Symmetry: C9
Subunit: 137 residues, 9 copies
Amino acid sequence: MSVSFRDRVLKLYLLGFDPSEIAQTLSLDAKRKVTEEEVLHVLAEARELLSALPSLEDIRAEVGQALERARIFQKDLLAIYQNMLRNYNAMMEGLTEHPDGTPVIGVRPADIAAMADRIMKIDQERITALLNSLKVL
Amino acid sequence: MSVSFRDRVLKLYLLGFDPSEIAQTLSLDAKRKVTEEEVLHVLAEARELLSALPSLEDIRAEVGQALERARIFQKDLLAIYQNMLRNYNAMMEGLTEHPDGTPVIGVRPADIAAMADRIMKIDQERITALLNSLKVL
Amino acid sequence: MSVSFRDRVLKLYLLGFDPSEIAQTLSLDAKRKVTEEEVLHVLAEARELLSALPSLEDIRAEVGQALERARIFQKDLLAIYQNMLRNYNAMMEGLTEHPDGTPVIGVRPADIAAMADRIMKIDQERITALLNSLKVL
Amino acid sequence: MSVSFRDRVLKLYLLGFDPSEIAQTLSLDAKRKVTEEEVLHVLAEARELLSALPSLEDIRAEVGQALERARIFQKDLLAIYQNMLRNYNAMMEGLTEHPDGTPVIGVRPADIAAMADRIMKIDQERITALLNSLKVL
Amino acid sequence: MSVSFRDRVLKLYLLGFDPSEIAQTLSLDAKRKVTEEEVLHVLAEARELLSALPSLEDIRAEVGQALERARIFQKDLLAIYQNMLRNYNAMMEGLTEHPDGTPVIGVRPADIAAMADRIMKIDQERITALLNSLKVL
Amino acid sequence: MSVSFRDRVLKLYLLGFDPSEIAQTLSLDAKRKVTEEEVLHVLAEARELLSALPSLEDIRAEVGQALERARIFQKDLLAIYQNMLRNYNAMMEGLTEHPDGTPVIGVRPADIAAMADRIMKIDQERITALLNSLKVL
Amino acid sequence: MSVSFRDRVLKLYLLGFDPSEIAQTLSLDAKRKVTEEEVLHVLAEARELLSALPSLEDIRAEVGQALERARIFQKDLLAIYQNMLRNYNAMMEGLTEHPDGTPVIGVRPADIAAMADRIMKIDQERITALLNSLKVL
Amino acid sequence: MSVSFRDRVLKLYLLGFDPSEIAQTLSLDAKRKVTEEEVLHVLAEARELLSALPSLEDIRAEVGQALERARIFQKDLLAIYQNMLRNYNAMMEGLTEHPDGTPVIGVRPADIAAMADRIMKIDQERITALLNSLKVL
Amino acid sequence: MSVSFRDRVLKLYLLGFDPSEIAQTLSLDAKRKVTEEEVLHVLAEARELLSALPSLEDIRAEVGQALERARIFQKDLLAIYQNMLRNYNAMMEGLTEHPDGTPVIGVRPADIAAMADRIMKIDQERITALLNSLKVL
């Protein structure tokens, strides 16, 4: 009723189950039975936990993490963009397969422009959010 | 006429039934019959319940819950994004199936960029709403 | 000419019937005949009923009801989202049917991101409208 | 030349007929013939009728009627939404027909989210327009 | 060179004919020939007619007529909307034809929501334009 | 080198021909040959003609003509809209042909709403531009 | 190294060739060879030519030319619009060919509304840009 | 626990693994086992690393790099645009293959206008971001 | 380690290779081997090169070049627009081929309006950017 129960009742409530069903699914989890009031006590308890206010350094944690979310995605998209631009040249020469024998998938030229715009969008998002971190905080 | 009746008459009204039909569907629910005035008394009664004003800590409850709605969805989408990026590499190599024998589903490169944008949208929504929670409240 | 007539003449007028046709459809409803002036008197009468101004607590009634419209819809969409995310995992494993024998319907990964965005849109609408209820009223 | 003629000449002009054709179509309506100047006199006459200014209570008439237009449409869409959500559950179970024998029509989950957004759009339109009625008027 | 010539030369010019072709098409209309200078004199003459400024009551004429354009269109769309909502119920019951024997045309539920939004758009346009007529004029 | 040459060199330049090609196409037009400097002198000459500033009554000429462009187009679209709404009723009754024997072309109900919106857009453009003509000028 | 070389090196650079390739393509153009420094000297030279500032009458040249670009395009589109509206009437009558024997191409009514909107967009662009020419300059 | 471990635990956490799974995947990486507290200590440690604030010269690093991201992409798109405009001319002449024997791929004229707009979008992004670098910094 | 190495390490880094792979690809380029610290020294060195600030005349260089990018593209699109408008007239007459024997490609009338809008967009971009060059600089 401390860690893996207070987490589970909160997570199962936010996916839209009434506290009757939250009890019945957890009635067979570990215990013999879980009463509805046992569920409903935790939901009101965890409500006030979530009702707290952040700190100024607490906000700096996500803005640190959100920009690092971006850099992981740019390592993925630039790997795609190079490997998509590979298929555009090999399609143009008429090669049905790459020299590695791997198949050549068709890529339109307006599709490469889409992935170019996605990358520079992310790179522009770093500059804007980092500047607001300096400005607001 | 206290809990499972006042809830039901309100929920059935907001789905757009006239109080005649709300009576007739609940005429066979528990009682022998439910009069229309018995229904219409509750709807005017629960109208003033809903007409109340929130509190400042009451608003902090949803903003706590709305950001926690986000974190449950990011645990889902990042699980998709990894398992979608798995299918992109295995399609490129020409593997009809994964080494686990599971089939390989085709994924366009502009589709991965869509799921990348959905995730960083949610992550940006946490920063904006949490800052307004500090600013307004 | 009190309840089920003044309602009917107003509702039939706003669906775009001239008062001649409003008379003729209601000429065979209950009475032997309904004159056009009998119809047109009620429309001018109910015009001034609708021309009234609301009260400040009257506006609080809909804002109470509009947010409760949202919570009924989130109970529906989250039930879909869980049962749509069920079909995505079972499609990935290659199961043509669920272990319950029910068929597996194909779900694209960009479709799950659509239902994720609809839910958090509604949840953000509660925060904005409830805050304006505190601010304006 | 009083009621059913001044209405007809105005309505036929605004559908884009020159006053020659307005005469000729009404030349065979009731009279032996209708001269063009007989038509053109009425159009200049009814021009100044339409050129009048509204009153403040006159504007309150439509704002009363426009919100009542909304409530008639919500009685229709919520009837659709329930009867569309019926088809989604019965499609999921694999029932080709309903237990009433009626056919089951396919509904995508992103389509239910469309009708959910249409309803709460209308409900939000009531709050905005009613508040402006209190604010401006 | 007064009415049906000054109108024709202006209308034919604004559809993008050079004054040579305006002459030649009207060279065979009524006269033996029409010189280019005869055309070009009228175009410069009617230019200054169009170059005039409106009056304040002149603007009130169109705003009267523009709102009456709306009411003619709402009489059409509401006639469609009722007769489209007829086909939705009869499609749902499985009736290939109406009880009148007329065929049943398929209507998607998101299509009814489109016509609902068009109507309330027009009704909202009356309130905005009529209020500006009171405000500006 | 006065009228039909200074017009032609300007029009052919703005369609993107270098002055070499402007010379060569006009080298065979009338003269034996046209030198490049003969072309390039006119382009610099007509450059300063276009570089002039308008007058206040000069701007009133187009605003007169632009609104008259609108009225010609509304005479066309309203002729379409009536003749499109003819095909919608005759399709609904099941008539493969009109009583004139002309074929019946299929019209969706959302298409009629498109032409309704185009017309009232144009009618709203007259009110806005005419008011700015009174306001600015 | 004066006219047809300084133009060519600038035009070939802005299409994205490194100065090595600009040399090699022009190595076989006229001369025996063109060194890279011969290319790179011109690019730095023409850089400062482009780095100059305009004059106030210089800006009036393009605004003169940009509006004249519009009038050439309206002579084209109005020629299309008349010849597209020809095909709409002849399709409606059922004529597979025109009386000239030319084929009849199918035109939807929403397509004519597109070309109507393009023309009045251009005509509105003349009024806005010409007024700014009076206002700014 | 210094470089290739603190990087890996952070990168694997931001892809949405709970610290139990981060331990188990790295339990077989190098060590015999990695405890959950060993993982969770690093995540709280690296949280404060990311929680730091940037410097003013630190922001100048990305704005330098973001504009250099643009120039690499323009070297790619201009190479496409020339080699796409090659296929448009050769398609127009009717050449199924290029004179090099390479196949001719079909290009619509509205597609070339898309790549033209992408390039000048990027070129306009350099001017805006570089000016803000002068303005803000 | 001066020109073709500092350029290559920077360009290969911005395409998203870790400095290990930047070393290994350049380990076989010219030298026997390239250490990772040899790579990582240059990346930190070139970081401060990119971290510099522009000059006011430096910004005038791109704005000169960006407008000249436009004029090269208008020479291309106007060449397309004339040669697309050629195919529209020849399709209308029914000519399967041009008098030159070249094939006639089908062009919709709404497609010509697209290329008309692209050109006047570019021409409007010259006026706006050149005016800001006078205004800001």
